[model samples]
Target chain A: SGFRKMAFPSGKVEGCMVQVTCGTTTLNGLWLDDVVYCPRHVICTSEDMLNPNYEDLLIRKSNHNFLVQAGNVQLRVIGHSMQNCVLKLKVDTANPKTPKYKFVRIQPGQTFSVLACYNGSPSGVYQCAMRPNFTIKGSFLNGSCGSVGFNIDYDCVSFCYMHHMELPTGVHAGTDLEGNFYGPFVDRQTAQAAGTDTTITVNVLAWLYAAVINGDRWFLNRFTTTLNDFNLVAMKYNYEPLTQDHVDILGPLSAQTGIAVLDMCASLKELLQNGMNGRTILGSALLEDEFTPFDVVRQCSG
Target chain B: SGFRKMAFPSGKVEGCMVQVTCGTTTLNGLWLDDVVYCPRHVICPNYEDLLIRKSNHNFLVQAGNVQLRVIGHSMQNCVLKLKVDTANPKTPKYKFVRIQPGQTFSVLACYNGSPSGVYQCAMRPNFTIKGSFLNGSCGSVGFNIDYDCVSFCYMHHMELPTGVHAGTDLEGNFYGPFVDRQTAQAAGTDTTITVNVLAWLYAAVINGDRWFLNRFTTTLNDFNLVAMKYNYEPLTQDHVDILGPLSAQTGIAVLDMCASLKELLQNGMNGRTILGSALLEDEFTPFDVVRQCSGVTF
Candidate 1:
């Protein structure tokens, strides 16, 4: 409740303080603790998961590009309205070359996701705070946000790194559509079996985030990586490319929010826009596909 | 984590200081939080989630039966794991039945029909990790559960005086839920929300002299371990459905744990979790209003 610059959080996630780093963006960057927040699906709403009755905040002209560009170099990061907490966005590019951000907003409607997804707060006062906790920090085209923290020197992720840059066995290392690196993109399910047998540490969040992203399912059960823990609710939109407003509305779909799901979860793929070029947000490694640009993600709030 | 418990948990769940209901005797009963000690499908051997480590006892058999007669009148619950967690005779039962550290099936194993037997229950023993006081196991190698049933769990009755007419509990002061914020604000009374699985319990620390309100659920138990005091209504993501992970570090803990939910509460205002509904102490202003969170599932 008293954290600085964090998102609205559930009770279990309040202690995991996120520490973002620079230039080098890897999934689940630095950490005082190896825990994750909003460990369910891509947390796209600003509705207070804690206080479902109260209106929280929104992500108007916040910074999302620094996280996208920082990775290669890692990362990334919602909401509302009953009037269910929905949000509007104006997307633009944050490539190292772009000097200004563009604006994107929803065309005004009370429509919402099939899931009650977001529940709008009663007033605009709670509206602004109803977005995701980790609001982007950078320059905005509308002169809405300043650019003092333009360059992201750090990467934030839901999972963390305890060893060297090395990945697990069988887990492949590859670049995402954004030309950034990630692994455990093992093209198989037994990989999950191996993961359980291998680690002394239980980075269950990291492991599942890896398994689900490519959206592969398990043919059979072997160990307890809980491969079915890989299932998610993504409403795919065929081949329709994600737009700025889409990102603003569905930006919470990431390994960061614990939503790592199957590659067939097209809603996740469609929502994977790289905010760097105003295309995708930062998050973790997933099964390989050119569907969207990938970035490591971090939970900025409980 | 200094919330007060009558002592050891279960039984009447003691008038809503916690949630004590159960579900259809299916794979996972009504509440999944207790079964979800660890977030993953398997209760992967971890420091916090697995309820076995740092314990002060063993899975000794109590005098009971496997059928509904296990817990005496009004003393039954969902026995998550009875494989190693139980076994019986003419009818000797297992009543307090909580899902243990790694019995699996909050989606680990599956069967047919509504009421089925838990086919797998072989929990793997992964010894020693950080923060744990014992060398125990987590991560079920198999589902070693059997013909079990869910019981009536309790829902804490304490709340933040959402209304003007406040009352007291065993502690002399506590509130129940109200009919929406405005109705309560408009001085309306009589229609308080009666059935809530989520509520808080007001309590304090006990000294030889008197009650020192610690606010946190820092009840130092017999083991001297201050386990995080919380509860949940269980979850829906069970065998087959990948219902994502639970937020907050909340998990279903067994009785007599050594760690402190108090420490967790301190961690919470600072973030925390327990099962589904927890009366966490690390809140913005818990003392004034009993700021506890009840599980959507717990």
Candidate 2:
């Protein structure tokens, strides 16, 4: 599966608006309330699991990252042709996020793993979207995607549309492979977990442009101090590493989307190359190994 | 946050989309898309995300699922709200699937984990009608969705209409107490993780229905054999228990659309409930804990 881009002219997802249809085939990245549009009524193609007549399937979105139900559905590649199939890459321009989505003409058998490169922007919400809405789409349904779970930030916030989505967990004091900081602790669980390891060189990156343009050059510094104090009050809480010095460590050239603190760096010298740089971030707490970086604001001045 | 089921006119979802102005907002199971009727050119809501406006946003139905995107910008309180936000035991129906030609959403932090369920029915082709294209009233987008990852699936013969769709790995295998599973695997170095166990169960219900309909009188015995051998092999990596007469058992009952699977049973044993029954033929097994008998095909 390579990279490509697709655009829906009208942007209408099917089987979501009304209750006319019974069941639906899984398609990835569809929002709720998406209309299951069909020139006529939508029908089940195969009736069994692996029906490759994709000319008719729709999948809905959900939180909790889990499917409503789980089961086995076999697919039969009637044509076994990859011509009609496509592989897509969705870049969250603001998030420095580059995710992959691919549709095949086979059945995702029964097993799979997601070995993705956390490539893309450095800031707001970033993620990879795939089909069948199951963790097993890789094996069960002839689908595979590599989506970035990070964000990006450039100098277009004021004039252009700026997406300010943040990762589930804010940036922390430790460095990911990208040599920037991440994690302010998404919850008590994550906070306490990070607190136990003191050797880790926790880092957090704030928006360079957001701070400078907003006349808050010290915004990152202030956030770091504030987060530390907040964490001290609750030992289970986590600290923030948002500060100019931290961003400087992230390398001035690094771009920030902010989808997720980690996962991207404009230059390889700045943050991690891809999620591969993050391989060690979650594995151990070794301070030397955890020096990470995040691409803060793309540019400070207009 | 809560379960809901609602309806929309022609231009509510993809027909017309909206933005999220605040956080902590709960917009459940609602379709949002480009307003085909809106006269103005679509504005770039957020450079990186999708932002909601104060006024109502009309939706359209060009094709598959009503897609939600940030569209050159980012929006707050945008959780990709959909009908499957919560579960309602009362009104039991699989969440409607969304198919879009424009944007792919982020399910988990990892975009790869987006696709969550197996929806074969919604994969038809979407085409634009002659007169409809000019006025933005194009016919539905064809629903050609299939996996292209060789590692995921080799079925590469399917064609995609817009080539833009996204979701989470919430369907199929690995759908339960995510924390526990994440901890068990990721806790160490295995890197092996599991999500979307519930989806596996949902797939099982429908699959069971299809099986029963295709093959008469499917015994729990046959169901488990297939479940372990075929369904969740990836999540458990062939570690699933088999030959256990009864640890977790999924029962099947046939009935009309109205009657519930619970009442349709001869002894009134719900599918999952009987899974725990202490019967020689119904012992707990790895495969049983993950499934229920909901969509038994008659």
Candidate 3:
């Protein structure tokens, strides 16, 4: 496996550009723009971000007793927790609001993937939740069901690519609780070239700097408060300080650009300094604002 | 001169009607309705009440310097409190009436034979002044000056005995009107400037005389009267009358003082005298009075 980089016309891709290869069937410079990708199987678009059903993917990580497999246009379920338990799988397509396949059953430890294609293709796939019924000799037996749920946890649009991949030594991904990514790339070249870059810490800082100059007290107040919250959350999580290498990545650019990321670092340090180790304050600013857990992690490291 | 009643047009008189006779010079159907009246000289409208300038009256009854008179409006019958030096602190005269709306009254009493000292009239809902009758020696100089100062203090809610001690244990300690008001304004509290005024007065005069306070602090309204009594030159009987009804309406008590400041100033003047007169005499001219008192003078 050799390292490779691909260039594209300006604004051609919406998000990260990655190469997908399956034994000579190479998909290079394939724009995963506006799409979320999971290991080799899960993928989603920006519109899916707004989908209530999209959260179904976020919650499925630990789902046990039943497993969902979304093939080309088919959704399958395997019952691994209970034998002789009736498994009901409901599927609703993105259109018309009805399930073509409702209450599909699966045997214990057996996979049932032969689902009907919606609109003759997998393009219109929408939502699904698994329900497992326990029965003794066909008589309904009520019992505690293991974690039986639905989500696209293993899907591409669900978690960040860096989250899925092991980070390089001395490098970390700035991401949110849900693994959305950000960066304050030291050089503009690297930042512009970055395919999946969504948030630039420098840009946010510069915007704040301009806001300070423009006499926007409201923005400054909210911004500083958010930073304070970010630091508090990091302190609770027991995350470590930024390594020298990590600081080098963003430190030079911040000084050169006059929008110091170190100022943000100071904010983080102050948040940790104040002895208010409470969840309410930390959780409010971290989860509610545009920033994220990963952003806290990145700030700590930087 | 004896018992006589007079009649008026149906609704022309809302209260009572009486005939006031002095040596056959009869004033009949004189609307005494809903107003306070003095014996022969002082009478007022439905809204005015009459109180004697007892100190001047006392002086006139003895010195033959000048007669005393009163004029005001009154509504209900009420008591007017007065002071007769520190030895007897609770001298009260029940003569004035609660004043009704839209009426005035005046009364006169000949000292030796002619009017003297400022005739004080008091009315309920606080017996403030309407004005005076005849001006003479003792009546004109100290009486008017004292009345002007008392009126000024009342209007601005400034209380007396401003406990500004320089050295000793009471050093820099202040109470009553100015101190309480400043605290109220600075803290943006809802306490009235008058209550603070009374508190400061209580701290200054009572000092540490527990027996005097036992008789003095009976009711919160009592503080208002005491404040009037211990003013720089003492309020005219009319002004003291004003304190009574004001105390009734607002129910601001010296005992309650300020719960906020109780821990710090609960003991008040704490047997602290000697500086009483000195502190009391620190009168600000009405011009500067308003500015320092309520931050505004109009």
Candidate 4:
């Protein structure tokens, strides 16, 4: 069609080849938010910013019968090899949670969106994070952040959410297995053992913004233990509250995390309210008034 | 030793007999917070307001044995009964974390050194409600509520604090059965299906402020479940908010029962954080969101 392809500045090493695939309606495309790069050097040039050509490249898809071709593709080649190259093309169309009218319908005369880099870190390590401005809401809405609350009764609510989420049918909470993406409370003794580690401490050592329930009833689902402070309450650099720079230390959370955090609370509160149903005379809520090991130890390294 | 004997109010009631037992220490006297009332009369009088005469009674006490007993003794009638009534004093001493020795105690003691209400509702129709108070540092610190800021993918940054609490031993998140405090989401579909009642939509429900650790990751001596909503946010019911008032129109929890209603949230924001270690995320930090159901269908 018009301009078949486009590319931007990324580290390119000579003699290396970049394999590309054609992007069309019949195919799937991934428009990265920015270009990733190695900090070693700036491989910049006009020739390096040319459109990619894909005549042959192998990509995988979720749906396949015994041995079915995932999808149709056209590969291209890059004259020069790039050190930190970004793949800007579509390889599959019949995606599993993607809208499924025809699954892999490729409209004629479609254009490939240009890939670009927008932000950079101080170290010059490119922060290439991106998201497509697409919106779809069906029977259920899915997202990156989810939450649920529970009694500190020695039962981890996260694991429970994960287990419940694993159910086949209805809407369920997802999981983060690889410690790379998730963390979990190990045990009650570990949770209750008090210390002064900034990393972990008294049941509640911080005053960060918190999800308070009734009058000061902030349930700590993680420790299965009750504490005397808000989940968001911060602690002092030293073991004492005296002389800590608290005035500026206390601030609202960032905008990006606000909404998702709320949703998690909503979900957890729903789950918690249900969990607390039944029987008239209930136990009064209390706060965790002690410190734990982590709170006494973990700190910013010199 | 100081001279000490007991006295009685108007004679004892027929069926009501005075009983007593002594602890490690012996009581030389008793102080009443208020007046004692006669079953028949409208008038209530303080100990100073009444004259007493002890007639038929007895006294008994041995070292550590609970065998010490006293019955309707003329001089010690009320004293014996008073001693028995305080086997486990409704009033308890309150420590920041644990009950301290020598301090006056009560179930409802406040932070200030003021006296709180007597455990009037201490006795329920069926069982007795009692508990001890022990304070502990809430949990680990230094770590950030910001950790939840990391979105899981399509997931947004959580509006609420998530992941295992920085120093918590059994960090977890689970929904309650909502309808019955005893029940909640089960392990498998079968358990969940069996518990399928329109509980979520019920007219009356209770949101227990409790937190439990997951089972698979517990240690041998692990035994603790927290039930308290610290600095919890409570929303108010407005014309725009209240779907209905008083009684619920639908199934369980489909109604609002909290009396403080909205103040819990505003109070929380002002640094007067109370209760447990929880952080309400987003609009969820308010009471407009959750509640518990009391009864079943009509």
Interface RMSD values, listed in order for every candidate: 22.0, 20.7, 47.4, 37.1
Q: Which 10 successive residues of model 1 chain A have the least lDDT summed?
A: A117-126
Q: What is the TM-score of each candidate against the true structure?
A: 0.17, 0.19, 0.16, 0.17
Q: DockQ winner among the candidates? A: 2
Residue-wise C-alpha lDDT for candidate 2, range A1-302, written one tens digit per residue: 11111111111122111112224522222112211111111223334223334333322211221221101221111111111122111111111111122212211111111111111101111111111111111111111111111111221111100111122222111111121123332111221222232211222222323233323322122122233433343232222323345435554433433322222212111222122222222111111211123212211222
State which candidate has the highest lDDT: 3
Which 10-residue span in candidate 3 chain A carries the lowest summed lDDT?
A1-10
Per-residue lDDT tens digits of candidate 3, residues A1-302? Answer: 00001011111111122332222222111112122122211222234423324335334422232222222232222211111111122222221211111122321111111101111111001111111111110100011011111111111122111211112211222122122323322111122222221222322333333223322223212133344455455545343233334345555435543544555555444534553232223112221122222222212212
Per-residue accuracy of model 1 over A1-302 as CA lDDT, tens digit each: 00011111111111111222112322221111211111110122233332332222222224352232222332343111111111111123222322122112211111000000001100000001101111211111111100111011121212211111112321112122111222332212232311221110112222223334323333112222222322221112122232334334323444344542233233333333321121211121221221112111221111
- What is each predicted model's overall lDDT from 0 to 1? 0.19, 0.20, 0.23, 0.17
Cα shift from native, residue A113, model 4 (Å): 61
List, in order, the clash count of every candidate structure. Answer: 131, 219, 56, 165
Better of 2 and 3 by DockQ: 2
Candidate 4's docking class is incorrect
TM-score of chain B of each: 0.15, 0.20, 0.21, 0.17
Encode model 2's per-residue lDDT on B1-298: one tens digit a residue: 0000001111112222222222322111212222111111122234133324422233221122323332232221212222222222222111223322111121111011111111111111121100101111111121211121001100111112222221112121111112211122211111111112222222334333222112233433443343344222232322222312121343322211102221222232222321112111111122222211111010
| Each model's fraction of native contacts | 0.00, 0.01, 0.00, 0.00
Ranking by lDDT: 3, 2, 1, 4
Classified by CAPRI criteria, candidate 1 counts as incorrect
Off by over 4 Å in 2: A1-203, A207-209, A217-249, A253-295, A298-302, B1-298
